[PDB]
């Protein structure tokens, strides 16, 4: 199963007054499933989160 | 801070060792041979 | 358990990482009309004694 998180960055521009704003960051790997890792193939315990 | 929050219940404590497994031996301890020589 | 709470009757406006807004209520009118103070008021006296 698949959890998808999201992820954010809240950026404000310094001194500018245009409003603040949310970002999703880091897409390619929260938004596609585990994978097997290729150093220990076998077990899904060694499949790790990115 | 301009937002609202929600009231909610505190949370169980958890530390790493609650999820993830500790790959140390507690029975077996290897031991190590002293040195500060490079070439040593 | 978070307090009650008064509610302040304050301008409520945040302007983002400058934070919350300076609240003039009444504008420019206490530093021309002047200060009023309406805690301390006088009921007028309406009747009197015959």
């Given at each position: 199963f698949h959890?998808?998180?999201?992820?954010?960055?809240?950026?404000?521009?310094?001194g500018?007054?245009?409003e603040?704003?949310?970002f999703n960051?880091?897409?390619?790997?929260?938004?596609?499933?585990l994978?097997?890792?290729?150093?220990?193939?076998?077990?899904?315990?060694?499949?790790?989160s990115? | 801070?301009?937002?609202y929050?929600t009231?909610?219940?505190?949370?169980?404590?958890?530390?790493?060792?609650?999820?993830?497994?500790?790959?140390?031996?507690k029975?077996?301890?290897?031991?190590?041979?002293?040195?500060a020589?490079?070439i040593? | 358990?978070?307090?009650t709470?008064?509610?302040?009757?304050?301008?409520?406006?945040?302007?983002?990482?400058?934070?919350k807004?300076?609240?003039?209520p009444?504008?420019?009118?206490?530093?021309?009309?002047?200060?009023?103070?309406?805690?301390r008021?006088?009921?007028?006296?309406?009747?009197?004694?015959?």
């Open positions: 959890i998808q998180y999201k992820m954010e960055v809240e950026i404000q521009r310094p500018d007054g245009t603040a704003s949310r960051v880091y897409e390619r790997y929260l938004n596609n499933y994978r097997m890792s290729d150093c220990a193939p076998t077990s899904v315990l060694n499949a790790v990115p | 801070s301009a937002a929050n009231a909610t219940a505190p949370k169980v404590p958890v530390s790493r060792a609650t999820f993830f497994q500790n790959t140390k031996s029975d077996f301890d290897f031991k190590f041979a002293d040195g020589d490079a040593a | 358990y978070k307090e709470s008064r509610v302040s009757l304050t301008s409520m406006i945040y302007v983002g990482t400058a934070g807004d300076l609240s003039l009444t504008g420019t009118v206490e530093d021309i009309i002047g200060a009023v103070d309406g805690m008021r006088v009921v007028r006296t309406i009747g009197g004694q015959t």
